[PDB]
């Protein structure tokens, strides 16, 4: 892929984070804490899952960023509507305003309803996410495997401003503490 030149500088929005997350000073890394991180509750925070949004809002154009997923057993990545539900249980689906992929129990899947099996030959250490707002496209690329395509959502009905979306996953196993990191341009 030759999407690199629509590169945008993404930072994380502390105010949207689940109360157990730790966001780095530079707002480019997030990880699961071992407790409540001593923040007040607010209506923006994802309550049930270890999720956080990027600060940037997109309503036009083409945008590209990269995320490091090294050493993690579980995570979700992609974009979502600014209007997504924050409290209680919900599925990741385009009907609920999410365009995502994930790793879970040694398989990769796209967040369709129902979920779609992904075919990845080289487990990725870094993921590229490309959004074309006008075309209605969200695509995922395997940076570890020369940028090979992972998945394309097309005919997307965004229905509002989009935000970068992150889930660091639970760490019941003790093998998923590693952070998600926004990679430099
Ligand atoms: O793995 C769980 C998280 N741990 C907490 C904990 C620590 C001591 C006694 C009981 C509980 C905790 C760790 C660090 C900051 C605040 C609380 C045990």
Swiss-Prot record:
Residues 8-185 form the B30.2/SPRY domain. It is found in: Cytoplasm; Cytoplasmic vesicle, Autophagosome; Nucleus; Cytoplasm, P-body. Induction: Up-regulated by IFN. The coiled-coil is necessary for the cytoplasmic localization. The RING-type zinc finger is necessary for ubiquitination and for the IRF3-driven interferon beta promoter activity. Interacts with SKP2 and CUL1 in a RING finger-independent manner. The RING-type zinc finger is necessary for ubiquitination of NMI. Belongs to the TRIM/RBCC family. The chain holds residues 291 to 468 of 470 of the full protein. It comes from the Eukaryota. E3 ubiquitin-protein ligase whose activity is dependent on E2 enzymes, UBE2D1, UBE2D2, UBE2E1 and UBE2E2. Forms a ubiquitin ligase complex in cooperation with the E2 UBE2D2 that is used not only for the ubiquitination of USP4 and IKBKB but also for its self-ubiquitination. Component of cullin-RING-based SCF (SKP1-CUL1-F-box protein) E3 ubiquitin-protein ligase complexes such as SCF(SKP2)-like complexes. A TRIM21-containing SCF(SKP2)-like complex is shown to mediate ubiquitination of CDKN1B ('Thr-187' phosphorylated-form), thereby promoting its degradation by the proteasome. This is E3 ubiquitin-protein ligase TRIM21. Homotrimer. Component of a SCF(SKP2)-like complex containing CUL1, SKP1, TRIM21 and SKP2. Interacts with CALR, CUL1, FBXW11, HSPA5, IKBKB, IRF3, SKP1 and VCP. Interacts with SKP2; the interaction with SKP2 does not depend on an intact F-box domain. Interacts (via N-terminus and C-terminus) with DCP2 (via N-terminus and C-terminus). Interacts (via C-terminus) with IRF8 (via C-terminus). Interacts with ULK1, BECN1 and with ATG8 family members, including GABARAP, GABARAPL1, GABARAPL2 and MAP1LC3C/LC3C. Interacts with TRIM21 and SQSTM1/sequestosome 1. Interacts with IRF3. Autoubiquitinated; does not lead to its proteasomal degradation. Deubiquitinated by USP4; leading to its stabilization. Autoubiquitinated.
